[PDB]
mmCIF file of C-alpha atoms and ligand atoms in Angstrom:
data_model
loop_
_atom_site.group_PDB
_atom_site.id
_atom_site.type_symbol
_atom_site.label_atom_id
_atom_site.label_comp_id
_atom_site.label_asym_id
_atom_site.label_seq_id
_atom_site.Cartn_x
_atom_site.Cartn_y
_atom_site.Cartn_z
ATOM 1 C CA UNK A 1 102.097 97.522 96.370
ATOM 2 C CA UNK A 2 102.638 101.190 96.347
ATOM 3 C CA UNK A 3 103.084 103.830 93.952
ATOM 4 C CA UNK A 4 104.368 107.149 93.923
ATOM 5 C CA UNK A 5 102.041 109.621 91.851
ATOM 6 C CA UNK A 6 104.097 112.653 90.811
ATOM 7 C CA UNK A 7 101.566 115.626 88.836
ATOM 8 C CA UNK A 8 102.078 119.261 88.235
ATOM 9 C CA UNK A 9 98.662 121.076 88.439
ATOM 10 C CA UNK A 10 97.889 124.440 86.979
ATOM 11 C CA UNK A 11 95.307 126.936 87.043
ATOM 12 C CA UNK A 12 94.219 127.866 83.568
ATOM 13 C CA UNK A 13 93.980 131.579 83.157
ATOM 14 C CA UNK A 14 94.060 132.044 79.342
ATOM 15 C CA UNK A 15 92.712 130.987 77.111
ATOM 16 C CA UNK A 16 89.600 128.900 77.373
ATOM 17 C CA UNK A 17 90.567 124.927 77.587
ATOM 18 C CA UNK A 18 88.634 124.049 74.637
ATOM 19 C CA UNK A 19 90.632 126.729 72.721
ATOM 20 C CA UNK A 20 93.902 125.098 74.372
ATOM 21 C CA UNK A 21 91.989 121.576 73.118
ATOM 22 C CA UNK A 22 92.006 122.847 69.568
ATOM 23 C CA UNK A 23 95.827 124.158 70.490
ATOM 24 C CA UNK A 24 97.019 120.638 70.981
ATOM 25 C CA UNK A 25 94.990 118.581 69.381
ATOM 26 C CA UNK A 26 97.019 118.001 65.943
ATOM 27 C CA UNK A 27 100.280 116.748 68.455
ATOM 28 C CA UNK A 28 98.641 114.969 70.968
ATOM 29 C CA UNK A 29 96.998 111.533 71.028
ATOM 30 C CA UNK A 30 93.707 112.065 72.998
ATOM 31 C CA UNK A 31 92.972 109.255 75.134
ATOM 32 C CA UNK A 32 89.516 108.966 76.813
ATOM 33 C CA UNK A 33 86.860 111.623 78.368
ATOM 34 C CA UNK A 34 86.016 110.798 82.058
ATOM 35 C CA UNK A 35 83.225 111.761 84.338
ATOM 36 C CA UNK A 36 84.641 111.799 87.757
ATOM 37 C CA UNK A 37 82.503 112.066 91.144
ATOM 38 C CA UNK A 38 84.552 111.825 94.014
ATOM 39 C CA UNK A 39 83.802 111.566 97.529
ATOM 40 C CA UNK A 40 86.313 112.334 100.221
ATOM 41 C CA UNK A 41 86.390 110.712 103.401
ATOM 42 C CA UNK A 42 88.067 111.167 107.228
ATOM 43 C CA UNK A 43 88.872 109.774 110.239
ATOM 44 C CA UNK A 44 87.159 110.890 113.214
ATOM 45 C CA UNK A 45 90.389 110.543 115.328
ATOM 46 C CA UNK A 46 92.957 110.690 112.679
ATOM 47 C CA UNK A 47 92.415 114.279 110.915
ATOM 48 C CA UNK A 48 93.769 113.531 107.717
ATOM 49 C CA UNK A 49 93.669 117.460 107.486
ATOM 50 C CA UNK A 50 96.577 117.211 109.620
ATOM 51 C CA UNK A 51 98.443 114.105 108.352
ATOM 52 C CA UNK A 52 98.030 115.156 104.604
ATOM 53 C CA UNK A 53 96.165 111.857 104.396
ATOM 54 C CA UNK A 54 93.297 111.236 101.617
ATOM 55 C CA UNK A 55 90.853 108.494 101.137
ATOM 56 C CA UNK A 56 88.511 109.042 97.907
ATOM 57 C CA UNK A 57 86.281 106.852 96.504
ATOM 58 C CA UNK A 58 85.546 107.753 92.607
ATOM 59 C CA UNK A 59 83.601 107.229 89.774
ATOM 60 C CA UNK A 60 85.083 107.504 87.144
ATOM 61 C CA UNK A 61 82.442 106.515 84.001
ATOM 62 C CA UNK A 62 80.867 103.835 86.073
ATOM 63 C CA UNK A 63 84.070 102.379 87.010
ATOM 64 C CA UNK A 64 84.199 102.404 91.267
ATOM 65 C CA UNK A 65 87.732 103.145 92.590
ATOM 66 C CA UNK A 66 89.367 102.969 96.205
ATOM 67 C CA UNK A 67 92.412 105.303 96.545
ATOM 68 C CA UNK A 68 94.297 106.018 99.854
ATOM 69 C CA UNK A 69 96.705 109.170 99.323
ATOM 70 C CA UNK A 70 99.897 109.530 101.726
ATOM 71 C CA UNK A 71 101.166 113.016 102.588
ATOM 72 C CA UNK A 72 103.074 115.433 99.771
ATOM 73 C CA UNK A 73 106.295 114.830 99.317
ATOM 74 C CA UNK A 74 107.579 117.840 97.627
ATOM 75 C CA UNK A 75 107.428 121.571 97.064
ATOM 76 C CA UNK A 76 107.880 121.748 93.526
ATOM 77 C CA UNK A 77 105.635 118.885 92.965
ATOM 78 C CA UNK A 78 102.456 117.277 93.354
ATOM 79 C CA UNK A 79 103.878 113.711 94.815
ATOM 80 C CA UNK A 80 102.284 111.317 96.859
ATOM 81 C CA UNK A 81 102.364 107.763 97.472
ATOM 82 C CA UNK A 82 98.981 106.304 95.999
ATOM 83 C CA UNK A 83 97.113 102.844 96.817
ATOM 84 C CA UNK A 84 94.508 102.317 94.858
ATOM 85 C CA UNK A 85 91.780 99.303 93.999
ATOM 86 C CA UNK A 86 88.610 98.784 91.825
ATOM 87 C CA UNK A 87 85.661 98.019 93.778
ATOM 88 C CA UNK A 88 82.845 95.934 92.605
ATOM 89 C CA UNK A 89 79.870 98.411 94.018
ATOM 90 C CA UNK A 90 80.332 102.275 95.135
ATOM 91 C CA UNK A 91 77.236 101.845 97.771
ATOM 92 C CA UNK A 92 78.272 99.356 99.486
ATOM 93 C CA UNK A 93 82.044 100.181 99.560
ATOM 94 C CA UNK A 94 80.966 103.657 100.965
ATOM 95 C CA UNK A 95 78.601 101.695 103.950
ATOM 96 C CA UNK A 96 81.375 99.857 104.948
ATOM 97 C CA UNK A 97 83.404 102.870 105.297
ATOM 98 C CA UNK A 98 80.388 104.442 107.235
ATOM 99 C CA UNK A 99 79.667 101.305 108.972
ATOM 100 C CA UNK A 100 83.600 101.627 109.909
ATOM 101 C CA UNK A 101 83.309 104.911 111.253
ATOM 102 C CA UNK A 102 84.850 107.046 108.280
ATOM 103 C CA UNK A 103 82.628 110.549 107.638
ATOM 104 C CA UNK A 104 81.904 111.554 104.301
ATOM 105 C CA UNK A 105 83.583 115.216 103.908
ATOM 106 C CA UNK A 106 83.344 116.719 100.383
ATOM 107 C CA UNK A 107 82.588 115.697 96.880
ATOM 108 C CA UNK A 108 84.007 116.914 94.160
ATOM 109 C CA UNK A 109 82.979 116.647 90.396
ATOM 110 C CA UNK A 110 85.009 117.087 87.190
ATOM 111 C CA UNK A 111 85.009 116.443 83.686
ATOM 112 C CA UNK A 112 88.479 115.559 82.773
ATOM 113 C CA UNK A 113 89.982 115.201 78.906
ATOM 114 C CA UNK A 114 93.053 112.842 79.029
ATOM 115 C CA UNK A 115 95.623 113.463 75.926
ATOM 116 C CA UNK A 116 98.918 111.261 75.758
ATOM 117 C CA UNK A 117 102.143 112.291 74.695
ATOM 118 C CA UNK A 118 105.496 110.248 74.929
ATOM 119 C CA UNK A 119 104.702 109.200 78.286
ATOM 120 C CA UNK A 120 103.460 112.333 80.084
ATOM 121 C CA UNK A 121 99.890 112.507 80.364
ATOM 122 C CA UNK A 122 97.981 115.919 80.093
ATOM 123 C CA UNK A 123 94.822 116.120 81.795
ATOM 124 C CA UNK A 124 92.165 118.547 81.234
ATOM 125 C CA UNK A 125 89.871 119.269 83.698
ATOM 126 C CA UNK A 126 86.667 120.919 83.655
ATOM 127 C CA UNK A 127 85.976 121.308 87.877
ATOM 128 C CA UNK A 128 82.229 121.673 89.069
ATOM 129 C CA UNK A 129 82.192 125.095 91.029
ATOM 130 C CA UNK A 130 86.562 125.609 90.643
ATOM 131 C CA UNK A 131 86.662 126.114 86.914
ATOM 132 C CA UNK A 132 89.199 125.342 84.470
ATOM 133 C CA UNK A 133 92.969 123.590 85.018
ATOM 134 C CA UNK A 134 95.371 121.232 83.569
ATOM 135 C CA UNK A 135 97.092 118.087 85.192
ATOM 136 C CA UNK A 136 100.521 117.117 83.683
ATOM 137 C CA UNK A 137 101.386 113.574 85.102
ATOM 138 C CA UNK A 138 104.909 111.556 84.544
ATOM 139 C CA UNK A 139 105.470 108.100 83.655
ATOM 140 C CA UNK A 140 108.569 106.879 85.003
ATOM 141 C CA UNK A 141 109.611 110.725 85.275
ATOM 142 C CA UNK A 142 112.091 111.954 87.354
ATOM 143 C CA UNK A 143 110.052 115.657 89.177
ATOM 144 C CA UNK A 144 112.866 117.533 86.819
ATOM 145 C CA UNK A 145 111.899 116.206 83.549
ATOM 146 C CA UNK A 146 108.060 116.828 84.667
ATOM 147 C CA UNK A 147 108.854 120.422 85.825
ATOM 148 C CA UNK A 148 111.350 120.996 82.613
ATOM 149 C CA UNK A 149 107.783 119.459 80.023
ATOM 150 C CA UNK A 150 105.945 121.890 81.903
ATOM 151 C CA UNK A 151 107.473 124.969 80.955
ATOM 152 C CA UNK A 152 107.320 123.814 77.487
ATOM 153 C CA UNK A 153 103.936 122.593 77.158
ATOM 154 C CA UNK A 154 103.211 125.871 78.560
ATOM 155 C CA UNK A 155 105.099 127.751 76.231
ATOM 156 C CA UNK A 156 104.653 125.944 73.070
ATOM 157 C CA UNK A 157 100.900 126.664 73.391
ATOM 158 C CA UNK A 158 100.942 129.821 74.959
ATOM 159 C CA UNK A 159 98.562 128.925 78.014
ATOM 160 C CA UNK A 160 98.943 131.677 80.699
ATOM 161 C CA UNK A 161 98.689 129.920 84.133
ATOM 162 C CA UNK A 162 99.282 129.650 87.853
ATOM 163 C CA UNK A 163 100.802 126.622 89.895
ATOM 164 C CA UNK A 164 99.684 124.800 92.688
ATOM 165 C CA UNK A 165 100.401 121.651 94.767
ATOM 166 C CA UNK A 166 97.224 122.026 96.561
ATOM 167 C CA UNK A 167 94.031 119.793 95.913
ATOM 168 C CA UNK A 168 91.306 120.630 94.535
ATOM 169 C CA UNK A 169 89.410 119.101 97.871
ATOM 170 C CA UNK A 170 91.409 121.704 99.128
ATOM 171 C CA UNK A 171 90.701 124.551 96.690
ATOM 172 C CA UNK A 172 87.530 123.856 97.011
ATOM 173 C CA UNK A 173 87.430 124.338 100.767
ATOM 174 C CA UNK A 174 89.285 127.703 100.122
ATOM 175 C CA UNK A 175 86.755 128.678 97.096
ATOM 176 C CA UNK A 176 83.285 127.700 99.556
ATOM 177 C CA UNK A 177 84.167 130.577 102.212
ATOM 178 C CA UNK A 178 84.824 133.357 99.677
ATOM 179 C CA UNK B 1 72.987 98.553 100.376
ATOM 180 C CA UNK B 2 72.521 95.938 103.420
ATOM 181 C CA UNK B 3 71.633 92.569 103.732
ATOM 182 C CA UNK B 4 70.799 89.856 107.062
ATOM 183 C CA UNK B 5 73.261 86.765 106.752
ATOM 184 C CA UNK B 6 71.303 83.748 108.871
ATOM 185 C CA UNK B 7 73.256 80.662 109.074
ATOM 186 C CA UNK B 8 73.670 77.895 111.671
ATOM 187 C CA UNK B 9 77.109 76.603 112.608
ATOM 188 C CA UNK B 10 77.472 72.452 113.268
ATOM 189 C CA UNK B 11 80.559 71.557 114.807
ATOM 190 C CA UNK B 12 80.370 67.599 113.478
ATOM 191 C CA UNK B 13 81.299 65.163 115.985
ATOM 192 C CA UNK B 14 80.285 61.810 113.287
ATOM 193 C CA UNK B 15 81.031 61.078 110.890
ATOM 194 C CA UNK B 16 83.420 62.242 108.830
ATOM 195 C CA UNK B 17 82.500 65.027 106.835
ATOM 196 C CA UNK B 18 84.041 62.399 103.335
ATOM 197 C CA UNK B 19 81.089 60.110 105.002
ATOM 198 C CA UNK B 20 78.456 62.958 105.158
ATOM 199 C CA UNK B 21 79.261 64.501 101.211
ATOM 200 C CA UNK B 22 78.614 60.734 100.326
ATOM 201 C CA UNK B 23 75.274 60.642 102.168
ATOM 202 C CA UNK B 24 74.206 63.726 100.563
ATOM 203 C CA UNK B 25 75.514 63.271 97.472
ATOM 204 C CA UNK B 26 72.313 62.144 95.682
ATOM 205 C CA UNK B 27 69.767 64.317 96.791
ATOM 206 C CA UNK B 28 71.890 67.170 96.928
ATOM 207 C CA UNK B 29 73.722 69.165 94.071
ATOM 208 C CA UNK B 30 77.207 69.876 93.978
ATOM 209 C CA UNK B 31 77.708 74.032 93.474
ATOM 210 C CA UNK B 32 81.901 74.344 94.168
ATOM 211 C CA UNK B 33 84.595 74.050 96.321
ATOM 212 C CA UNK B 34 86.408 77.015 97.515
ATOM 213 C CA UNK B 35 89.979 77.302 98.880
ATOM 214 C CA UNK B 36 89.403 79.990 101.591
ATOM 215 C CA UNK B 37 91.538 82.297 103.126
ATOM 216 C CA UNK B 38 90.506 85.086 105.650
ATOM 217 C CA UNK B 39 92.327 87.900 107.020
ATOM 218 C CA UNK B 40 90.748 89.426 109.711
ATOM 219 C CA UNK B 41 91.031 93.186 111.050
ATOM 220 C CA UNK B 42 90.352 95.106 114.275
ATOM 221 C CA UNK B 43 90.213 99.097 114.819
ATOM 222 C CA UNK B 44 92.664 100.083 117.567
ATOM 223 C CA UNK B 45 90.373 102.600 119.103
ATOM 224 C CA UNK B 46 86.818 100.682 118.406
ATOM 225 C CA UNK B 47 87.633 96.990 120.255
ATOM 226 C CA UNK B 48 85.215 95.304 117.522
ATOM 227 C CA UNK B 49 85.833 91.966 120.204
ATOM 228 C CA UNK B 50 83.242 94.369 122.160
ATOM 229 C CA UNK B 51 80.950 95.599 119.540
ATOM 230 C CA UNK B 52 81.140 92.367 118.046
ATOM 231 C CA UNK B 53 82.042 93.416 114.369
ATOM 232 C CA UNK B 54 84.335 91.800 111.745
ATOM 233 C CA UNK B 55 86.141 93.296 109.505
ATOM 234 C CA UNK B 56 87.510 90.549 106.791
ATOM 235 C CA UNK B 57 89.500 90.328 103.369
ATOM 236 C CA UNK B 58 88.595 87.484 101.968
ATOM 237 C CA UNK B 59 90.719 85.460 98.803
ATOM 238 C CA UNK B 60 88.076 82.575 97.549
ATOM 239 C CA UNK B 61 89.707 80.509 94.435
ATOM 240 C CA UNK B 62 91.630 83.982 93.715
ATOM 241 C CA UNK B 63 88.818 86.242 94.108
ATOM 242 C CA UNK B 64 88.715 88.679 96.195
ATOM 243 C CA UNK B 65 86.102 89.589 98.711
ATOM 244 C CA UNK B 66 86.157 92.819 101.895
ATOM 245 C CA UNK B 67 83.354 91.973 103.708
ATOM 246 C CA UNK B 68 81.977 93.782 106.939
ATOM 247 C CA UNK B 69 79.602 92.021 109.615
ATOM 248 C CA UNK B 70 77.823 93.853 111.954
ATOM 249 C CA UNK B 71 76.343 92.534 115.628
ATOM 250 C CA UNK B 72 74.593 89.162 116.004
ATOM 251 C CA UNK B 73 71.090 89.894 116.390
ATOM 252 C CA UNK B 74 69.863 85.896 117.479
ATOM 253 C CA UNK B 75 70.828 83.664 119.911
ATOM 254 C CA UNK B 76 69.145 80.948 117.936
ATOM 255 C CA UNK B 77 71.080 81.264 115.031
ATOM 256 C CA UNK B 78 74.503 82.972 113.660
ATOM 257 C CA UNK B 79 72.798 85.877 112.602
ATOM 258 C CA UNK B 80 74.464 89.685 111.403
ATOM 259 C CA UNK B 81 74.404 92.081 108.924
ATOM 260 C CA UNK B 82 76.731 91.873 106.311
ATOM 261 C CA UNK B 83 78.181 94.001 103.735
ATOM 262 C CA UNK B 84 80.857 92.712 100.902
ATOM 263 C CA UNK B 85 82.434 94.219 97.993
ATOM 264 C CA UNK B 86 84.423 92.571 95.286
ATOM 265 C CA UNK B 87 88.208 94.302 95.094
ATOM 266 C CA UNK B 88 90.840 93.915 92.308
ATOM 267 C CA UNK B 89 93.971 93.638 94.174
ATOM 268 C CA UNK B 90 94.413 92.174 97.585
ATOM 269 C CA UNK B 91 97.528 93.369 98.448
ATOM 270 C CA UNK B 92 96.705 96.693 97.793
ATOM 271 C CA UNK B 93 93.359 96.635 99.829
ATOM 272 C CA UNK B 94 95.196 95.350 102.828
ATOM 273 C CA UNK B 95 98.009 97.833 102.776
ATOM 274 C CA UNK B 96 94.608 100.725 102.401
ATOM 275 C CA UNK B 97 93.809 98.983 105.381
ATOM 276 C CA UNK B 98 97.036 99.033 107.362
ATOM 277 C CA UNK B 99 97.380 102.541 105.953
ATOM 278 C CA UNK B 100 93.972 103.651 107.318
ATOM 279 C CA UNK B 101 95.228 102.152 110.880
ATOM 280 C CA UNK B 102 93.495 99.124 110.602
ATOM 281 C CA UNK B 103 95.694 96.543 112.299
ATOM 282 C CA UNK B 104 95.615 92.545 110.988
ATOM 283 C CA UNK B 105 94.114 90.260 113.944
ATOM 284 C CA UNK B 106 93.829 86.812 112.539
ATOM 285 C CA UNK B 107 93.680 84.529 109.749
ATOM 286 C CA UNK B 108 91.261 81.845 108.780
ATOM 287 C CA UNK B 109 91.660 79.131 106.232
ATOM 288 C CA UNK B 110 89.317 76.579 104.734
ATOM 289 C CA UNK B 111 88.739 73.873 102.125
ATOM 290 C CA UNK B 112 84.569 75.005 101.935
ATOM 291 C CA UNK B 113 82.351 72.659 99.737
ATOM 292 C CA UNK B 114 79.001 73.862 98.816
ATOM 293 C CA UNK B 115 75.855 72.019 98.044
ATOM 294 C CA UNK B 116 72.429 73.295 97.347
ATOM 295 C CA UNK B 117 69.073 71.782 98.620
ATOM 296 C CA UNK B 118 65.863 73.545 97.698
ATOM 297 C CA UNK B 119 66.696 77.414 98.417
ATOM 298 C CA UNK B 120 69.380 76.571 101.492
ATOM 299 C CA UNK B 121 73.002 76.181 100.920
ATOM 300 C CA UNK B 122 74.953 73.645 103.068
ATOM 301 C CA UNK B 123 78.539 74.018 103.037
ATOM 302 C CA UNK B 124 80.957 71.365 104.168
ATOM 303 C CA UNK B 125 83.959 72.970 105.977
ATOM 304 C CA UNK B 126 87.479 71.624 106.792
ATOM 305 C CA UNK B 127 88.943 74.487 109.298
ATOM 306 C CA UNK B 128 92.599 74.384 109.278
ATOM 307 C CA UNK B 129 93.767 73.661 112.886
ATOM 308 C CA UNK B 130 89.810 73.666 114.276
ATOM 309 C CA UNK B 131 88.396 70.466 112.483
ATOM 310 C CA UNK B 132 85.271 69.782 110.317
ATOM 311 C CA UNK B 133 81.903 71.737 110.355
ATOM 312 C CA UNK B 134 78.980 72.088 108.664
ATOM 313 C CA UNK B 135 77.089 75.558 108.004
ATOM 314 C CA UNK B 136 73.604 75.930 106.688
ATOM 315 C CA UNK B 137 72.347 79.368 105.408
ATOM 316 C CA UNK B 138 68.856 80.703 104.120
ATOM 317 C CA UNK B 139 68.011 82.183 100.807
ATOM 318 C CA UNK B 140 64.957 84.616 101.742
ATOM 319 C CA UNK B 141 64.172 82.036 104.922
ATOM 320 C CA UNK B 142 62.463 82.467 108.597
ATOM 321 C CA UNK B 143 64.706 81.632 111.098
ATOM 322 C CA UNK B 144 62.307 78.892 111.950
ATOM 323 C CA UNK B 145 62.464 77.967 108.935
ATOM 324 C CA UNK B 146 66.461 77.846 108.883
ATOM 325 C CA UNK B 147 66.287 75.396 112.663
ATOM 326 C CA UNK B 148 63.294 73.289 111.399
ATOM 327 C CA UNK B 149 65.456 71.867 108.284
ATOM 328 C CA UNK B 150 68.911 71.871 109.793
ATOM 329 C CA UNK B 151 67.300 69.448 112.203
ATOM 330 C CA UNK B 152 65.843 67.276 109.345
ATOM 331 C CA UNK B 153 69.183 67.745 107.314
ATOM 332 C CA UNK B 154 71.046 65.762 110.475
ATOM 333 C CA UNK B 155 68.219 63.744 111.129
ATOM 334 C CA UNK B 156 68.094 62.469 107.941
ATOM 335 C CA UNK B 157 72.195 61.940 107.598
ATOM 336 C CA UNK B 158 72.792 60.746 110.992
ATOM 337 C CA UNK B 159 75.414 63.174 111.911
ATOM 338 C CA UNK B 160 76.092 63.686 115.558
ATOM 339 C CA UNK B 161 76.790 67.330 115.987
ATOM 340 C CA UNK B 162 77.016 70.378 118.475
ATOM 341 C CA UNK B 163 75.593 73.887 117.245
ATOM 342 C CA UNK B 164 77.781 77.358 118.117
ATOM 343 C CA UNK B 165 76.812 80.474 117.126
ATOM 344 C CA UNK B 166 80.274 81.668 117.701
ATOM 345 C CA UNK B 167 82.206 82.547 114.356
ATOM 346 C CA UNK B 168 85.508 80.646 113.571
ATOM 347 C CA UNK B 169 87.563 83.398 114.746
ATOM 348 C CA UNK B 170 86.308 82.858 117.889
ATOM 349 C CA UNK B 171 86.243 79.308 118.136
ATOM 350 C CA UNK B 172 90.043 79.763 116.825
ATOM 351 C CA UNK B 173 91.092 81.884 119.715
ATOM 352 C CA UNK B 174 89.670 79.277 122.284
ATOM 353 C CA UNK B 175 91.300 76.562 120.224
ATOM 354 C CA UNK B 176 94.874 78.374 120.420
ATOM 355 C CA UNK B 177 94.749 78.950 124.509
ATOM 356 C CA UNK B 178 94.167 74.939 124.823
HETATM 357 CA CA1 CA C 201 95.386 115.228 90.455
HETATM 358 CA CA1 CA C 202 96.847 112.181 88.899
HETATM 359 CA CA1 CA C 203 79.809 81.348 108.290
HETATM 360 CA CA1 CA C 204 77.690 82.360 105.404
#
C-alpha cells in the first residue's frame, strides 16, 4: 500500500505567479484551489531529521489527512515513498499522536492552485512566510520525462527559477534563522 | 478532544449467551451486530504492558476505527480514556504504523451484538478462542450508577457470571499460556 511520489519543486523568481496564472491559463485545465495547514511531527528517539523521515498531518479545505514520508530517493528529483490516509477528526488524530509520544515541530501554511495537463500536475503555491514556487508532479512518469516537462514548462512560459529537492519544512527552518 | 470509556466486563458462565439475547429480547432493542477485528500495537521503547496503554486498529463491518486507551483509572470498573478516529484505508494506516516503528502485538476478533436499555448499551460478545461475554457501558453515567444496573441486568436474566476488569487482550494472553 505504498506509493512513490516523484515532484520537481522550483523557486519562482520572475514573474509574479498570478502573472504566470494568466501565462497558462488558456492551456491548462485548472483543477481546484486548496488551503493547506500542515503540521509536522517527530519522534523523540527516532530524529526523522536524520532518517529523512516525515509525518504531516494536513488540512487541506477541511479535508484531515495522515501522510508518512520515507527518505529521498534521488538527486535530480523530489521522490519519496508516501503513505497516506483520511482521518475522520484533525484533533483527535493529533492527541493520539501526542498521547503516543510524537512532538509537534513546525507548521506550515500554503495556498496552493492545482492546474492539470496530460497527466503532470502543476502546482502553484503561495507559502506563508517562504513566498512564491511551483510543484510539477508526474503521473505514472518516469523522473526523465518529469525533468525533460520541466524545462519546457519553464521555457514555454518564460518563468525564471531555481531548483530544489528540499522541503519547504526544511526551507522554512533555513528561512527562520536568517 | 478526550473522552472517559466506563464499562464492566462479564465473563458469562450460564447460560448461553443465544439463551440470554432471548431473555432480553423484549425489553431490550436490537442496535447491530458487528464483525470485529482488532489489531493491537505496542511501542518498542514505551512497554505500554507497563503503562497500561493500547494502541488498536480496529475493522467493524468494514469500517475502520484507530483508537488509543489510556490507563485504567477504577478498580471497580473497566475504566480509561479513550481516543478514536475514523481512517479510510486500513492497510495503509497499519503500514504508517509499522513505518513509525510501531510493532503489531495481537489480534482480537469478535461477533459483538449490541442492545440498548435506557441510556446503557449492553453488548453480547462471542471472543474467538476466549468464549462468551457480556459488556455494559454508560452514556453520561456514575460509576455507581454503571454497578447498580449491571447487577439488576443479571439479576433480572439469571445469568451466572464473573466480572474482570482486564481487557481481552489480556485475558487472551492468559488464555494462550494454558
Ligand atoms: Ca511537495
Ligand atoms: Ca506532491
Ligand atoms: Ca470493551
Ligand atoms: Ca466499550
Amino acid at each position: 500500500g505504498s506509493y512513490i511520489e516523484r515532484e520537481i519543486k522550483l523557486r519562482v523568481i520572475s514573474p509574479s505567479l498570478e502573472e504566470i496564472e494568466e501565462r497558462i491559463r488558456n492551456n491548462y485545465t485548472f483543477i481546484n484551489e486548496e488551503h493547506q495547514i500542515d503540521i509536522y511531527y517527530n519522534n523523540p528517539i527516532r530524529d526523522f531529521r536524520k532518517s529523512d523521515e516525515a509525518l504531516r498531518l494536513r488540512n487541506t479545505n477541511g479535508k484531515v489527512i495522515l501522510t508518512y514520508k520515507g527518505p529521498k530517493q534521488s538527486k535530480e528529483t523530489k521522490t519519496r515513498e508516501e503513505i497516506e490516509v483520511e482521518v475522520s477528526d484533525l484533533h483527535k488524530m493529533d492527541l493520539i499522536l501526542r498521547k503516543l509520544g510524537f512532538i509537534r515541530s513546525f507548521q506550515v501554511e500554503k495556498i496552493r492552485k492545482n492546474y492539470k495537463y496530460a497527466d503532470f500536475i502543476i502546482s502553484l503555491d503561495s507559502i506563508k512566510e517562504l513566498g512564491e514556487f511551483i510543484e510539477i508532479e508526474g503521473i505514472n512518469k518516469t523522473e526523465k520525462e518529469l525533468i525533460s516537462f520541466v524545462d519546457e514548462f519553464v521555457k514555454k512560459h518564460q518563468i525564471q527559477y531555481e531548483k530544489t529537492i528540499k522541503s519547504y519544512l526544511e526551507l522554512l527552518v533555513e528561512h527562520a534563522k536568517k
